Amino acid sequence: GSSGSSGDKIESKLLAKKAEVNTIPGFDGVVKDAEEAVRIAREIGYPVMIKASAGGGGKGMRIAWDDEETRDGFRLSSQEAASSFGDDRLLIEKFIDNPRHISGPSSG
């Protein structure tokens, strides 16, 4: 025998979207390991730029387009920061060739 129920059902008040737009305009956090770098990247949407948290600088870092690249680049990018500043703190930002933001799906 059971009894009792409830349902708030309160969300998206006065908000209407066409496609799930639940994403971050740019991840400024930090990656712990290559594996983690891949998970975060996917969320951001490839291509994904990878820089050294300790420093960074587009000139010198590497960019990834697929989990495979994210790792290959993370292993090095991380190793670099470990010698440049000392720590292996890395970074992941959204890379967009065109000046336009077409957040969404893409050919592949």
Quote the CA–CA distance of 59 and 37 in Å, as a whole number: 20
With residues binned 3-state (H G I as helix, E B as strand, rest as coil), the percentages for the chain, rounded to 5, are: 25, 15, 60
Which segments are annotated as binding site? Answer: 9, 41-102
Q: Token pair for residue 92?
A: 């992941």
Contact 93, 48 (CB under 8 A): yes
Q: Token pair for residue 39?
A: 């998970």
Q: 72: closest CA among 42, 88, 54, 50?
A: 50
- State the helix-helix crossing angle for 67-84 and 34-44, rounded to 10 degrees: 120
Q: Token pair for residue 60?
A: 């010198």
C-alpha angle 103/27/21, rounded to 5°? 35
CB atoms under 10 Å from CB of 12, counted, come to 7
Which segments are annotated as binding site for ATP? Answer: 9, 41-102
Strand, helix or coil at 51? strand
